[PDB]
Design an enzyme around this catalytic site. Sequence first.
Site, PDB file in Angstrom:
ATOM      1  N   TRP A 148       0.835  -1.200   0.000  1.00  0.00           N
ATOM      2  CA  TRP A 148       0.000   0.000   0.000  1.00  0.00           C
ATOM      3  C   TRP A 148       0.868   1.248   0.000  1.00  0.00           C
ATOM      4  O   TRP A 148       2.041   1.209   0.388  1.00  0.00           O
ATOM      5  CB  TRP A 148      -0.950   0.019   1.204  1.00  0.00           C
ATOM      6  CG  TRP A 148      -1.765  -1.232   1.314  1.00  0.00           C
ATOM      7  CD1 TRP A 148      -1.763  -2.122   2.354  1.00  0.00           C
ATOM      8  CD2 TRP A 148      -2.647  -1.780   0.317  1.00  0.00           C
ATOM      9  NE1 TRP A 148      -2.599  -3.174   2.071  1.00  0.00           N
ATOM     10  CE2 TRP A 148      -3.134  -3.001   0.820  1.00  0.00           C
ATOM     11  CE3 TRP A 148      -3.029  -1.379  -0.974  1.00  0.00           C
ATOM     12  CZ2 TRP A 148      -4.005  -3.816   0.089  1.00  0.00           C
ATOM     13  CZ3 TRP A 148      -3.905  -2.178  -1.690  1.00  0.00           C
ATOM     14  CH2 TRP A 148      -4.383  -3.381  -1.157  1.00  0.00           C
ATOM     15  N   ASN A 167     -25.346   0.704  -1.258  1.00  0.00           N
ATOM     16  CA  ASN A 167     -24.382  -0.364  -1.368  1.00  0.00           C
ATOM     17  C   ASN A 167     -23.520  -0.249  -2.631  1.00  0.00           C
ATOM     18  O   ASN A 167     -22.296  -0.399  -2.563  1.00  0.00           O
ATOM     19  CB  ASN A 167     -25.099  -1.720  -1.382  1.00  0.00           C
ATOM     20  CG  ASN A 167     -24.158  -2.852  -1.070  1.00  0.00           C
ATOM     21  OD1 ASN A 167     -23.372  -2.762  -0.130  1.00  0.00           O
ATOM     22  ND2 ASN A 167     -24.168  -3.875  -1.900  1.00  0.00           N
ATOM     23  N   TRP A 207      -5.920   0.549   3.649  1.00  0.00           N
ATOM     24  CA  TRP A 207      -7.341   0.342   3.838  1.00  0.00           C
ATOM     25  C   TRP A 207      -7.842   0.733   5.232  1.00  0.00           C
ATOM     26  O   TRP A 207      -9.021   1.085   5.367  1.00  0.00           O
ATOM     27  CB  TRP A 207      -7.785  -1.083   3.475  1.00  0.00           C
ATOM     28  CG  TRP A 207      -7.188  -2.153   4.334  1.00  0.00           C
ATOM     29  CD1 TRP A 207      -5.967  -2.781   4.158  1.00  0.00           C
ATOM     30  CD2 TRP A 207      -7.787  -2.764   5.481  1.00  0.00           C
ATOM     31  NE1 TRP A 207      -5.754  -3.681   5.181  1.00  0.00           N
ATOM     32  CE2 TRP A 207      -6.848  -3.678   6.011  1.00  0.00           C
ATOM     33  CE3 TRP A 207      -9.008  -2.592   6.142  1.00  0.00           C
ATOM     34  CZ2 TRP A 207      -7.101  -4.420   7.169  1.00  0.00           C
ATOM     35  CZ3 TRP A 207      -9.257  -3.337   7.287  1.00  0.00           C
ATOM     36  CH2 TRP A 207      -8.297  -4.212   7.809  1.00  0.00           C
TER      37      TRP A 207
HETATM   38  C1  LIG Z   1     -17.527  -0.635   1.743  1.00  0.00           C
HETATM   39  C2  LIG Z   1     -18.797  -0.996   2.491  1.00  0.00           C
HETATM   40  C3  LIG Z   1     -18.978  -0.501   3.793  1.00  0.00           C
HETATM   41  C4  LIG Z   1     -20.200  -0.699   4.468  1.00  0.00           C
HETATM   42  N1  LIG Z   1     -20.378  -0.195   5.758  1.00  0.00           N
HETATM   43  C5  LIG Z   1     -21.557  -0.437   6.439  1.00  0.00           C
HETATM   44  C6  LIG Z   1     -21.736   0.029   7.763  1.00  0.00           C
HETATM   45  O1  LIG Z   1     -20.806   0.504   8.435  1.00  0.00           O
HETATM   46  N2  LIG Z   1     -22.934  -0.231   8.386  1.00  0.00           N
HETATM   47  C7  LIG Z   1     -23.990  -0.825   7.683  1.00  0.00           C
HETATM   48  O2  LIG Z   1     -25.092  -0.966   8.189  1.00  0.00           O
HETATM   49  N3  LIG Z   1     -23.827  -1.304   6.403  1.00  0.00           N
HETATM   50  C8  LIG Z   1     -22.609  -1.093   5.768  1.00  0.00           C
HETATM   51  N4  LIG Z   1     -22.456  -1.579   4.479  1.00  0.00           N
HETATM   52  C9  LIG Z   1     -23.423  -2.624   3.997  1.00  0.00           C
HETATM   53  C10 LIG Z   1     -24.542  -2.009   3.135  1.00  0.00           C
HETATM   54  O3  LIG Z   1     -24.040  -1.246   2.051  1.00  0.00           O
HETATM   55  C11 LIG Z   1     -25.585  -1.150   3.874  1.00  0.00           C
HETATM   56  O4  LIG Z   1     -26.127  -1.831   4.987  1.00  0.00           O
HETATM   57  C12 LIG Z   1     -26.704  -0.768   2.896  1.00  0.00           C
HETATM   58  O5  LIG Z   1     -26.256   0.153   1.897  1.00  0.00           O
HETATM   59  C13 LIG Z   1     -27.903  -0.208   3.637  1.00  0.00           C
HETATM   60  O6  LIG Z   1     -28.869   0.236   2.697  1.00  0.00           O
HETATM   61  P1  LIG Z   1     -30.345  -0.283   2.972  1.00  0.00           P
HETATM   62  O7  LIG Z   1     -30.803  -0.209   4.422  1.00  0.00           O
HETATM   63  O8  LIG Z   1     -31.274   0.437   2.023  1.00  0.00           O
HETATM   64  O9  LIG Z   1     -30.139  -1.847   2.609  1.00  0.00           O
HETATM   65  P2  LIG Z   1     -31.200  -2.891   2.025  1.00  0.00           P
HETATM   66  O10 LIG Z   1     -30.850  -3.154   0.597  1.00  0.00           O
HETATM   67  O11 LIG Z   1     -32.631  -2.433   2.157  1.00  0.00           O
HETATM   68  O12 LIG Z   1     -30.917  -4.253   2.887  1.00  0.00           O
HETATM   69  C14 LIG Z   1     -31.563  -4.471   4.136  1.00  0.00           C
HETATM   70  C15 LIG Z   1     -30.542  -4.530   5.277  1.00  0.00           C
HETATM   71  O13 LIG Z   1     -29.650  -5.611   5.091  1.00  0.00           O
HETATM   72  C16 LIG Z   1     -28.350  -5.266   5.527  1.00  0.00           C
HETATM   73  N5  LIG Z   1     -27.440  -5.265   4.374  1.00  0.00           N
HETATM   74  C17 LIG Z   1     -27.709  -4.875   3.069  1.00  0.00           C
HETATM   75  N6  LIG Z   1     -26.560  -5.028   2.376  1.00  0.00           N
HETATM   76  C18 LIG Z   1     -25.564  -5.465   3.200  1.00  0.00           C
HETATM   77  C19 LIG Z   1     -24.210  -5.766   2.987  1.00  0.00           C
HETATM   78  N7  LIG Z   1     -23.590  -5.581   1.795  1.00  0.00           N
HETATM   79  N8  LIG Z   1     -23.483  -6.234   4.054  1.00  0.00           N
HETATM   80  C20 LIG Z   1     -24.063  -6.313   5.322  1.00  0.00           C
HETATM   81  N9  LIG Z   1     -25.414  -6.062   5.522  1.00  0.00           N
HETATM   82  C21 LIG Z   1     -26.126  -5.617   4.473  1.00  0.00           C
HETATM   83  C22 LIG Z   1     -28.414  -3.868   6.142  1.00  0.00           C
HETATM   84  O14 LIG Z   1     -28.667  -4.107   7.530  1.00  0.00           O
HETATM   85  C23 LIG Z   1     -29.633  -3.297   5.415  1.00  0.00           C
HETATM   86  O15 LIG Z   1     -30.293  -2.239   6.079  1.00  0.00           O
HETATM   87  C24 LIG Z   1     -21.239  -1.414   3.835  1.00  0.00           C
HETATM   88  C25 LIG Z   1     -21.054  -1.903   2.532  1.00  0.00           C
HETATM   89  C26 LIG Z   1     -19.838  -1.697   1.861  1.00  0.00           C
HETATM   90  C27 LIG Z   1     -19.635  -2.343   0.500  1.00  0.00           C
END
Ligand SMILES: Cc1cc2nc3c(=O)[nH]c(=O)nc-3n(C[C@H](O)[C@H](O)[C@H](O)COP(=O)(O)OP(=O)(O)OC[C@H]3O[C@@H](n4cnc5c(N)ncnc54)[C@H](O)[C@@H]3O)c2cc1C
Length: 419
Positions: free
Chosen positions: A274, A309, A327
């Site tokens: 990195w 996401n 990272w």
């Molecule tokens: C780089 C990166 C960092 C992230 N950091 C966080 C964070 O700190 N906290 C956080 O809550 N989410 C994080 N996410 C996961 C995810 O992107 C978010 O939970 C999501 O965007 C929430 O949008 P939503 O409630 O409309 O999800 P929806 O599409 O409606 O999904 C329902 C629920 O499922 C869970 N979920 C959905 N996608 C993921 C996923 N990829 N991984 C884990 N759980 C998921 C969340 O609890 C979400 O509210 C991260 C994803 C990435 C790629």
Amino acid sequence: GPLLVWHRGDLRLHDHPALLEALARGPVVGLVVLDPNNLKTTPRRRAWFLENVRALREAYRARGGALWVLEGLPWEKVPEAARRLKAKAVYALTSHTPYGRYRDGRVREALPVPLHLLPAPHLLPPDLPRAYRVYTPFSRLYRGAAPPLPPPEALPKGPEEGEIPREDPGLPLPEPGEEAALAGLRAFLEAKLPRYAEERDRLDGEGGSRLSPYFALGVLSPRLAAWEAERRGGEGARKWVAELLWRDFSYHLLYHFPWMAERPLDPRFQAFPWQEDEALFQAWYEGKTGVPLVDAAMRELHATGFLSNRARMNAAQFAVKHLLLPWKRCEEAFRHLLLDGDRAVNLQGWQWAGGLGVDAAPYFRVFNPVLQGERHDPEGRWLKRWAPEYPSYAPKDPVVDLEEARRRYLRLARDLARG
Ligand SMILES: Cc1cc2nc3c(=O)[nH]c(=O)nc-3n(C[C@H](O)[C@H](O)[C@H](O)COP(=O)(O)OP(=O)(O)OC[C@H]3O[C@@H](n4cnc5c(N)ncnc54)[C@H](O)[C@@H]3O)c2cc1C
Ligand SMILES: O=c1nc2n(C[C@@H](O)[C@H](O)[C@@H](O)CO)c3cc(O)ccc3cc-2c(=O)[nH]1
Ligand SMILES: [Cl-]
Ligand SMILES: [Cl-]
Ligand SMILES: [Cl-]
């Protein structure tokens, strides 16, 4: 003597094993401790937590009950409350995190009465014996949600103590509290769920529930959400529950592989060279990369505390793969900007997007940030809201040469993964 119900990342009355376990035995008083170990964070996150504690107090009051809020170290304040109330015991949901275990150990030592910890509601628990690095085999253990527990009806009278500070978030918060969360869930399941599979990769994240900020604080039970989606059923339903399960997979990963907070899950990447670089870190952090998608994402995150996401994975991977930024710094800076910021989930997401060993996601998948925008932002409406500077997804004096950066990463990563 009352029983104390100590709420942590479970600021709700619905589906709360500790609350019900206690109420079935006698009168209860709720407690939240404002703990500097969690509250020395950004204003947006302090305020999101505080305002949901305020909402939970309102919820207790509306039912005729008593929620204490004390400020300080849990191993001082929890025993304080138990003495002042003459409580017979304290109940809380288990936390499987290093700090959760440390803090709860210290609290149990200092309490002269039992601390009874009950399993938090999950789709799958984090602490099953088998370690999985891959989501598919883990997800097969899930057989459908158990029914959630009801909230109490009315709560027993008790004395209330403690103040909930008013702090400036610096941006518009969602409506706090479980009544708003549950309304949000029911609207999503009705209106959006049917096309969730077809719309969840939008850059604007408008196909999704936008419930993460509630899940992160336990304002909404994931068990209740999964149960409600399964009662709805149809095609969106299975895929949305699969994403709830990614949340539990993230807790599972950090539990079985706690050292992924320190280094890649894939040992082949633990020596990746990195390139620290203050200027480049800042260009990324402030969305001034000259890459429309990335800049839009980071500017939306700064302004709102939320990102889809599809934006998160593009913004995060860009830092790691195109910029070669360490990272760990990036991960932490990212989490501090997020209302839903949740260490295990953010670590999972970063290690997945960064090709660092989660879900055996392959190093060679590198987002093309113009194609990504073309595919996931139809009439370019999202780019226009968040970085209208840019006429298209075409990079505009980018802080690095994008194709060279691509070739550079792949060269480095091909040496590492296959050597
Ligand atoms: C780089 C990166 C960092 C992230 N950091 C966080 C964070 O700190 N906290 C956080 O809550 N989410 C994080 N996410 C996961 C995810 O992107 C978010 O939970 C999501 O965007 C929430 O949008 P939503 O409630 O409309 O999800 P929806 O599409 O409606 O999904 C329902 C629920 O499922 C869970 N979920 C959905 N996608 C993921 C996923 N990829 N991984 C884990 N759980 C998921 C969340 O609890 C979400 O509210 C991260 C994803 C990435 C790629
Ligand atoms: O018990 C607490 N949990 C707080 N948490 C919730 C947890 O970190 C909690 O301790 C669990 O996550 C661990 O049991 C917060 C979460 C955030 O996103 C932001 C702020 C906080 C603040 C606290 C706090 O002061 N007290
Ligand atoms: Cl933090
Ligand atoms: Cl016990
Ligand atoms: Cl049940």
